[PDB]
Design a protein around this ligand. Structure first.
Ligand SMILES: Nc1ncnc2c1ncn2[C@@H]1O[C@H](COP(=O)(O)OP(=O)(O)O)[C@@H](O)[C@H]1O
Ligand SMILES: Nc1ncnc2c1ncn2[C@@H]1O[C@H](COP(=O)(O)OP(=O)(O)O)[C@@H](O)[C@H]1O
Lengths: 82, 435, 32, 106, 403, 201
């Protein structure tokens, strides 16, 4: 009986190593939205990764992210001298 | 519904960190020494070291004895029980006075009882893995284990329970697809009902379908129940379960509140101590505020100054309003505060002086604020003056009617004219004495 | 005092040879 | 100090560099990388019909208009399965320390 | 959310042509369904099966020399055979997204476009670089595409999706060198033999003892180049099976103490190489003491990458070091990626983030070019960059300004 | 520990798909509806700039809807000067008309990606130029055009200060870089000592 329990536990373990979950239940999750509340009770919306939206104007200035590896932003004050 | 009561502004003794008294003491004003004594006695209560101690809130009428009583009660908090009682309630036609007093004492004492139970639930998938017959005997067909496939909302978990429970499974209608309420130690099965997932809209039935359990199969439900000792007394007093108790004529007279000392003390106290020292409950002695104590009969004081001698008696806050008066039930036996001189020796007297006219004005203003009506300076001064003339409680009662008169007259704030008109429409007893 | 002063001196002397310095003194980028 | 000086300036704006911590593309964590865009953030979420926390995940739209829910692995992937007791309402405080209880409801 | 801006799939038969193996397949798919040797059995037979049947001559020739197609006839034959057999799709029915090396000449590019728009009449065409696709395969707009094909090793950098042509470093170190070194080692210790192409049957052989087998009486196959190719097949099998890359400076103290590994030749000859199986993959990173060319001056993998980074502007190097993209067949060798990472870390200047994309687990590195091509084709915004038949027939036929 | 940030994918993860199970449960749910016919129809994208036409999978109900992604073709704002405009305003000694035209063509083709421009710049037809030089020339031409038509001051000196210093830093030898790190640690220790001193006072 001990050997049977051991082999049954091993078999069950093998089953857990293939895939836990594989579906998303589109019935509600597909259209329903996600929201959470932090420790401070503040609300935030779940940002879903959508393809690039069509730009309707000249907004969305070029960012050049690869340049941000060493630079962050441009402050207002400067040295202000020749 | 806010339903503002007579005196709800009191929220606590409002004593500073050092224990002294201040004016804006969380609603209650004045009464420095009295509020300091209230703080000392509430610290005593919180200590929960002494029992059977009584305190007397002696003071002339209008000193806010009940006000400071409710203040100290709120300071204690809803955690510890607070049973308010008036001397008139002791007079009962069905139960003797001393037993009513003992029941009130029991109510004043609280007791939190915890209860943790490990229970397993979920949709069952019954299956018995065939096992060789008992190896100690011959051969045949036996069952060494019974696996139950409890499925919960979070997942599935099969339990290889003891085979002896198979009788319980067959006893109740435990079929594959219903929710069962398993118990760790007992093991008894209590089917909650089929899963709502199978509750087809065309099936007409109720109380048979229940939703799936949310969370892991193994749940350790921790529940705490706070019941006063009087609750346990009443519960153990009357019977339950068969015995032809369903009768109406000879049993409907439930008011058998009569109680004996053997059951009250003794076994109940012992089981309470067993639950305490075992970790199943925690004793919580409260307070018994007895206003109008002078209204009690001498047969009540003679039992009070004996119950206070017991180790289990809780803290009692007496509040006598009368002065030197003959004790009820006695033949012209005058005693201070209408209380026998023997009981006054066992109570700490907290004297409360009369409110200063400035304190009267403060009380009137804070009561107007609590009511939610603005009052002009002249109107407030007139209210304070009339409260100095007659009883103070008359002024506070002139706020709401004056407020309504103002609102009906087209103005918002209570002008001096409104209070002046109300003082002539309504007046006090001192002026009514002119018969 | 007896040694900290010399350390501060040799640090300030070896701080910036001709401007190149990883901690600070980095020409700021131009916008575009 | 040397020819390389910030003394030069004109009618324009200059971007300042960040020192002591070199950043990476927006798809890196701000703690380790820099300017970590939330679009590439994997956060704990709870499904609708199931009552188990699948761990860190992020909503993403796929080909054909179908929305997918990527996932990640960390903290053995087991502590989060038990974290449902903290979102529905050591292995008990760890669920409260590893996260700020920012699990997505519904 | 309808996802109107998701993507589009319009034909786009990606054809990633490679020196060791050509790849092909429809766009939108994740793995190319077509993968066969590139060399044709020119007497034309180009197939994993047709290229293994004995006939009169069957001379093996690779149309792409140095990654550059030169024999247009053999290239056209390969394309036609591939289409007809594997795809069964009419030429002028679906566009094509063939790939090219970063060093494709203008004249050769124009000739390829002409061959595409004249003999096949495909509805559209677009010729993207191999490094660009390899970068898109990993979702990277900037990085070092360390190609390690069978004939060249090049750390091509890309900037915002555009290849830096001046940063490429065409190092001769490649699979061909490893195969030649393995052939030399074999000839030194034993005699290299043809695969079962000629071996009728094998027998049990004691480890290290001479093998015995029966010779087939089929055609002699006087063409030695075909014999050279059949031997290179087994050489590459050996390379991918047992050959392992060192993890340190390769001192002659640890290799003699590592575990032993076995390998069986086509004739059954069993031999162990646990002592020097890691000697051959050394010139790749340290081409300083290779027995073949002892007086050579080459740059290892890490050296090639560092040079490719330095030859480009510094403003992009932060995005190049941090996004090294390893690709090509040589990389699948055991401990290759780890050795490369170690060498780059010890060589790269500190304070600059160095991250190796975790993609060595699978063999998809070879197909990275085709994956990137299929990805690019599946895009909607890219649907306008295709060189349509109208742009060509108009008279321009200029792929330089359009690509 | 903290939440994870990853672009593509981690080592062991896995994503769930949509549900198509319980056909019996949803039998009548989807049996009471039909499918909108999808047709392999031809579509013409207006951004093609030519008469070519391709195919795409769309429903027969929207045979129109020329192309959704067509509105993404936003060309960069690059002035287009004439020959006389160059002769009058943009005339230069080191530069020439053909070189400026080539620079502007590369800029329009690569969308103001001066790095890729310099990379693909024809160093044969025109002598070697630097990235900062191309940027200065382009910005000067744009400013002159915007002025004569009637944005911010460009300083080539700044780029002359940033790139060489950053290169010299990137070329820090191992020993000198370790020495610089040691000097940084020593300066941090001095700062801590100064903090301790000011706190003790
Ligand atoms: N210090 C105080 N501050 C504010 N209100 C008070 C104060 N003392 C008494 N009152 C008011 O007096 C009224 C009743 O007082 P109470 O406690 O009944 O005294 P007694 O019972 O002696 O008449 C209450 O409505 C309360 O508003
Ligand atoms: N000209 C080329 N351009 C790009 N990739 C190439 C080129 N020539 C060969 N390759 C790639 O290099 C690989 C060489 O294979 P090889 O390294 O011998 O396989 P392995 O080492 O895994 O046994 C091929 O898979 C091929 O995809």
């Amino acid at each position: 009986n001990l050997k049977t329990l051991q082999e049954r536990e091993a078999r069950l373990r093998l089953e857990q190593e293939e895939a836990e979950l594989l579906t998303y239940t589109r019935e509600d999750a597909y259209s329903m939205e996600y929201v959470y509340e932090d420790v401070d009770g503040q609300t935030e919306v779940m940002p879903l990764w959508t393809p690039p939206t069509p730009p309707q104007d000249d907004s969305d200035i070029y960012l050049d992210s690869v340049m941000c590896l060493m630079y962050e932003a441009t402050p207002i004050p400067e040295a202000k001298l020749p | 519904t806010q339903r503002i009561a007579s005196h709800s502004h009191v929220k606590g003794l409002g004593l500073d960190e050092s224990g002294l008294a201040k004016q804006a003491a969380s609603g209650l004003v004045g009464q420095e020494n009295a509020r300091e004594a209230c703080g000392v006695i509430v610290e005593l209560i919180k200590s929960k070291k002494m029992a059977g101690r009584a305190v007397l809130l002696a003071g002339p009428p209008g000193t806010g004895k009940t006000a400071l009583a409710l203040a100290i009660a709120q300071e204690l908090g809803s955690k510890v029980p607070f049973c308010p009682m008036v001397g008139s309630e002791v007079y009962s036609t069905e139960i003797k006075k001393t037993e009513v007093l003992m029941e009130n004492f029991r109510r004043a004492i609280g007791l939190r009882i915890k209860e943790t139970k490990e229970v397993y639930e979920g949709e069952v998938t019954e299956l018995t893995p065939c096992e060789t017959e008992n190896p100690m005997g011959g051969y045949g067909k036996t069952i060494s284990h019974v696996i139950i496939g409890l499925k919960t909302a979070k997942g599935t978990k099969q339990l290889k329970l003891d085979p002896s429970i198979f009788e319980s499974l067959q006893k109740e209608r435990v079929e594959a697809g219903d929710v069962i309420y398993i118990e760790a130690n007992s093991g008894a099965v209590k089917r909650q009902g089929r899963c709502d997932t199978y509750a087809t809209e065309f099936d007409l039935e109720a109380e048979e379908y229940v939703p799936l359990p949310k969370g892991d199969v193994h749940k350790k439900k921790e529940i705490i129940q706070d019941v006063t000792l009087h609750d346990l007394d009443v519960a153990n007093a009357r019977p339950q379960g068969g015995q032809d108790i369903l009768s109406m004529m000879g049993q409907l007279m439930k008011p058998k509140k009569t109680e004996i000392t053997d059951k009250l003390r003794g076994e109940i106290n012992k089981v309470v101590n067993k639950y305490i020292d075992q970790g199943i409950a925690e004793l919580v002695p409260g307070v018994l505020f007895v206003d109008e104590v002078h209204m009690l009969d001498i047969e009540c004081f003679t039992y009070l100054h004996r119950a206070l001698e017991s180790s289990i008696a809780p803290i009692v806050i007496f509040a006598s309003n009368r002065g030197n008066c003959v004790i009820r039930g006695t033949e012209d036996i005058t005693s201070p505060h209408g209380i026998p001189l023997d009981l006054l020796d066992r109570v700490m007297i907290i004297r409360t002086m009369l409110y200063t006219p400035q304190e009267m004005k403060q009380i009137i203003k804070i009561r107007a604020q609590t009511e939610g009506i603005n009052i002009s300076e002249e109107a407030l001064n007139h209210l304070g003056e009339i409260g100095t003339k007659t009883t103070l409680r008359y002024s506070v009662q002139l706020l709401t009617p004056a407020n309504l008169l103002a609102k009906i007259n087209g103005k918002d704030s209570i002008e001096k004219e409104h209070v002046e008109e109300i003082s002539e429409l309504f007046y006090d007893a001192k002026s009514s004495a002119k018969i | 005092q007896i040694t900290l002063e010399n350390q501060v001196h040799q640090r300030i002397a070896e701080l910036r040879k001709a401007g190149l310095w990883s901690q600070r003194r980095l020409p700021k980028l131009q916008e575009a | 100090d040397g020819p390389f000086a910030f003394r030069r300036k004109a009618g324009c704006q200059y971007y300042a560099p960040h020192l002591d911590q070199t950043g990476n593309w927006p798809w890196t964590s701000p703690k380790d990388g820099g300017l970590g865009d939330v679009r590439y953030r994997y956060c704990l979420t709870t499904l609708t019909v199931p009552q188990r926390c699948i761990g860190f995940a992020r909503r993403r739209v796929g080909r054909g208009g179908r929305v997918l829910l990527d996932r990640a692995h960390s903290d053995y992937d087991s502590v989060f399965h038990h974290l449902d007791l903290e979102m529905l309402s050591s292995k008990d405080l760890s669920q409260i320390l590893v996260n700020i209880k920012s699990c997505r409801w519904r | 959310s309808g996802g109107v801006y998701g993507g589009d799939e319009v034909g786009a038969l990606v054809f990633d042509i490679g020196s060791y193996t050509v790849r092909a397949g429809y766009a939108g798919e994740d793995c190319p369904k077509v993968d066969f040797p590139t060399a044709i059995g020119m007497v034309y037979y180009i197939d994993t099966n047709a290229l293994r049947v004995p006939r009169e001559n069957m001379e093996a020739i690779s149309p792409l020399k140095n990654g550059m197609v030169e024999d247009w006839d053999s290239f056209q034959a390969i394309l036609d055979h591939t289409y007809k057999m594997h795809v069964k799709s009419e030429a002028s029915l679906h566009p094509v997204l063939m790939s090219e090396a970063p060093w494709n000449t203008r004249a050769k590019r124009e000739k390829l476009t002409e061959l595409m728009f004249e003999h096949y009449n495909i509805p559209a065409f677009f010729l993207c670089k191999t490094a660009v696709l390899t970068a898109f395969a990993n979702g990277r707009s900037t990085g070092l595409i360390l190609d390690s094909g069978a004939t060249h090793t090049t750390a091509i950098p890309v900037h915002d999706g555009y290849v830096l042509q001046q940063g490429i470093v065409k190092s001769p170190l490649a699979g061909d060198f490893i195969t030649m070194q393995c052939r030399e080692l074999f000839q030194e210790m034993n005699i290299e033999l043809v695969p079962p192409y000629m071996i009728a049957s094998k027998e049990a052989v004691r480890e290290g003892s001479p093998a015995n087998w029966k010779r087939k009486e089929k055609l002699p196959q006087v063409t030695r180049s075909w014999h050279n190719y059949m031997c290179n097949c087994v050489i590459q099998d050996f390379q991918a099976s047992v050959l392992q890359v060192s993890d340190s400076t390769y001192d002659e103290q640890v290799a003699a103490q590592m575990p032993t590994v076995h390998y069986e030749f086509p004739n059954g000859y069993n031999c162990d190489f646990g002592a020097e199986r890691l000697k051959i993959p050394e010139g790749l990173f340290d081409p300083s003491n290779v027995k073949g060319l002892s007086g050579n001056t080459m740059l290892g993998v890490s050296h090639v990458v560092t040079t490719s980074v330095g030859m480009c502007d510094i403003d992009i190097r932060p995005g190049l070091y941090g996004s090294v993209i390893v690709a090509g067949g040589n990389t699948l060798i055991q401990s290759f990626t780890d050795r490369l990472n170690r060498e780059l870390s010890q060589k790269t200047p500190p304070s600059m983030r160095l991250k190796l994309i975790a993609n060595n687990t699978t063999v998809e590195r070879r197909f990275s070019s085709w994956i990137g091509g299929s990805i690019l084709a599946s895009l909607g915004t890219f649907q306008q960059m295709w060189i349509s038949k109208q742009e060509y027939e108009e008279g321009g036929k200029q792929c330089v300004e359009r690509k | 520990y903290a939440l994870l940030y990853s672009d593509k994918k981690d080592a062991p993860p896995l994503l769930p798909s949509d549900t198509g199970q319980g056909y019996r449960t949803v039998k009548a749910k989807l049996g009471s509806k039909k499918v909108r016919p999808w047709k392999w129809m031809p579509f013409t994208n207006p951004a093609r700039k030519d008469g070519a036409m391709f195919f795409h999978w769309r429903r027969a109900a929207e045979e129109g809807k020329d192309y959704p992604f067509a509105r993404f073709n936003k060309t960069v704002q690059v002035p287009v000067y004439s020959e006389q405009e160059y002769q009058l305003y943009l005339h230069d000694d080191a530069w020439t008309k053909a070189e400026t035209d080539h620079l502007f063509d590369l800029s329009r083709r690569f969308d103001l990606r001066f790095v890729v421009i310099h990379d693909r710049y024809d160093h044969q037809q025109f002598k070697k130029r630097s990235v900062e030089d191309l940027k200065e020339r382009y910005y000067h031409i744009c400013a002159k055009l915007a002025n004569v038509r009637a944005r911010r001051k460009e300083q080539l000196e700044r780029l002359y200060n940033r790139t060489p210093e950053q290169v010299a830093e990137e070329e820090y030898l191992l020993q000198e870089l370790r020495k610089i790190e040691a000097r940084k640690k020593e300066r941090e220790k001095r700062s801590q000592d100064l903090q301790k001193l000011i706190t003790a006072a």
